[PDB]
Design a protein around this ligand. Structure first.
Ligand SMILES: C/C(=C\COP(=O)(O)OP(=O)(O)O)CO
Ligand SMILES: C/C(=C\COP(=O)(O)OP(=O)(O)O)CO
Lengths: 178, 195, 197, 180
């Protein structure tokens, strides 16, 4: 009921500290920000990178291999978001994201941040989008557990898969191919 | 790039019962009181005083001595502040501060968000990153982190904020290091310069 | 006019073989052995010193250094041009404006004549630099008190932070500049007593 | 036939350090708490707390008297037009600064390299600066009793010379130039 999406990371949107794999599937972090041009599409403050392809309508889904990562946040964002200074990643600011911080605190990046009580920490999360209905939901791609879903909102403009990592840990954030 | 801000108070902004020093780098509350004209550029009901220089970008920080002072509240506020009346100095009104009350430290200066500090602070730092909504406070004894306020979307210029509810002892603002500025350096150099 | 709290990071290419730097390059120890490293023209070979990375040629800058439990140390500013090889004295004529602890005393300009009569033991020392003023000062960061300002010098060239570790007891910590909650999630209740690595 | 030309020296506000305060008659000099917001034109001493006169000397012998009074810190004299004004330089004849003065209210010094410690019998309340461009003389006297204070080693003067005044301290007594 949701079209599988072949998502790849767009390095030109990557924060100067984020490392995009050669296949544009894995996402790591460096010790310090890299000397890269500050093109208007690149994220400068938030440790965020987008996909290469957007979604203007339909029902799409992709699965993210979060693995052992003790910090990660995934979701979607409007194209008209601010990428050069700090914005509170919130549906009001065009950000529909969930994730994990500190290895145990699962939260939905809303305002206020909704504290999720995940029974079993997911090793692979599935992001589900539904433009015309305004539904953003995240599931445990392994055992199908519903993690969280955002309230219905009327989407404006295109949507891009957004990925944010803050820590420098061994295990990387990889996107599962479709 | 971090800026070691040299914060001097603005007597316009100051309160009619706070008494600034001549350098305007210290403030104290005594029995006598000013009776200065309550213009729109100043505070009247709640004891407050602001720094003249207001920031609109970059990273800035400054230190403040509060040794042997009972009740104080240091932090950062906007330049588009409310200056008349007695509203709550809570992030919703544009005031992010760190305070002491009842021998306790409270974040956001609201009674239930109390900080669990294991030692009394004699000199605190006030950090500000404009492009990050970052307003942080530091324990300058070990340069350790104390508290970072909930990240605020900054509209216009902000400026240093100071509030003294303690009559006992003055609140000192640490000036930026000036080296040997305005002072003759002998052939052997200055040794343990004081004043 | 404006003071810049510097974020100093050591340069391992200038680090004496007996100097062991941390992964963040913000602290250094004197190891029991040598590292068997190349003797590149940037590295000190006889005196145990290491410089900061970014150099200064104008403006006001300062950095704090934790020197607690270090018996023989020397810190300050030096010229980018100073000779790395040899055992030349760390004096202003050779391009070194330094504050030193030697023989359980404090010596300015690394001179036995200029003993500093401090009665408090230094734990965190701030190194002040004002290029246009020829000013190299030092401060006791416990009370933000003044220690010593070196004789005014026409610098004429880029200047770099200078560090000499002479003991094997305890490391030399170069305090990084405050970065607030950079790269850290501030919870809805605010970030309380952050301790990082 | 005249012995010298008495100089009617008035302070040039366009050269004064942003921390200095020039009077309305341009005769008195005072300091401020912090620097003013004045443009950093080339003629302004941005680092040293110095100020120049308005007219220079290309030749001849000139003399003027400066009232120092109870001031605990002051330094006066002449200097070349090509002196360094935007950063610190040691005010010595080597750098084009012929200056003497008082520091800490008691230590009189001729600002040479190294500074010369002066022994002053009677603290001068009014100092006279004598300049002889032809013989390279820069001389300082006690204007009240005419007694000599200090004379710099005679030099070959290059370029015009300016009356320069330097004060580092804020105090009630001001550095005042006495009119011709
Ligand atoms: C450090 C950083 C973002 C942290 O943002 P926040 O501090 O607002 O925390 P969160 O509510 O999880 O978004 C760069 O992406
Ligand atoms: C602070 C200052 C000048 C101090 O210069 P110096 O440090 O060379 O001292 P002095 O020998 O009296 O000239 C500004 O005029």
């Amino acid at each position: 009921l949701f079209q599988p999406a072949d998502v790849i990371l767009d390095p030109n949107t990557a924060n100067p500290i984020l490392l995009v794999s050669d296949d544009q599937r894995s996402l790591q972090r460096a010790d310090e920000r890299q000397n890269l041009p500050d093109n208007p599409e690149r994220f400068d403050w938030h440790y965020c990178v987008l996909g290469c392809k957007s979604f203007t309508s339909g029902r799409h889904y992709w699965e993210v291999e979060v693995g052992d990562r003790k910090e990660w946040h995934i979701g979607v964002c409007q194209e008209n978001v601010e990428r050069k200074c700090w914005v509170k990643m919130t549906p009001e600011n065009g950000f529909w994201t969930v994730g994990l911080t500190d290895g145990s605190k699962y939260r939905a990046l809303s305002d206020p941040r909704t504290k999720l009580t995940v029974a079993n920490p997911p090793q692979r999360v599935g992001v589900f989008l539904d433009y015309e209905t305004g539904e953003v939901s995240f599931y445990n791609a392994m055992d199908g557990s519903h993690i969280y879903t955002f309230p219905h909102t009327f989407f404006s403009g295109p949507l891009w898969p957004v990925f944010r990592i803050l820590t420098l840990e061994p295990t990387a954030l990889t996107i599962c191919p479709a | 790039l971090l800026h070691a801000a040299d914060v001097v108070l603005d007597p316009d902004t100051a309160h009619p019962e706070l008494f600034l020093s001549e350098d305007r780098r210290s403030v104290r509350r005594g029995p006598s009181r000013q009776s200065i004209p309550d213009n729109p550029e100043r505070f009247d009901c709640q004891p407050c005083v602001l720094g003249l220089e207001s920031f609109s970008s970059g990273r800035h920080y400054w230190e403040v001595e509060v040794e042997n002072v009972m009740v104080w509240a240091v932090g950062v506020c906007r330049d588009s502040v409310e200056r008349k009346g007695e509203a709550l100095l809570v992030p919703q009104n544009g005031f992010w501060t760190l305070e002491m009350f009842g021998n306790q430290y409270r974040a956001l200066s609201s009674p239930e968000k109390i900080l669990p500090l294991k030692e009394r602070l004699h000199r605190v730092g006030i950090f500000l990153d404009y492009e990050s909504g970052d307003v942080s406070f530091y324990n300058m004894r070990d340069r350790s982190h104390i508290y970072t306020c909930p990240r605020s979307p900054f509209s216009g210029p902000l400026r240093p904020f100071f509030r003294l509810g303690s009559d006992d002892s003055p609140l000192f603002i640490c000036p930026a290091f000036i080296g040997a500025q305005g002072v003759t350096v002998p052939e052997g150099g200055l040794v343990l310069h004081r004043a």
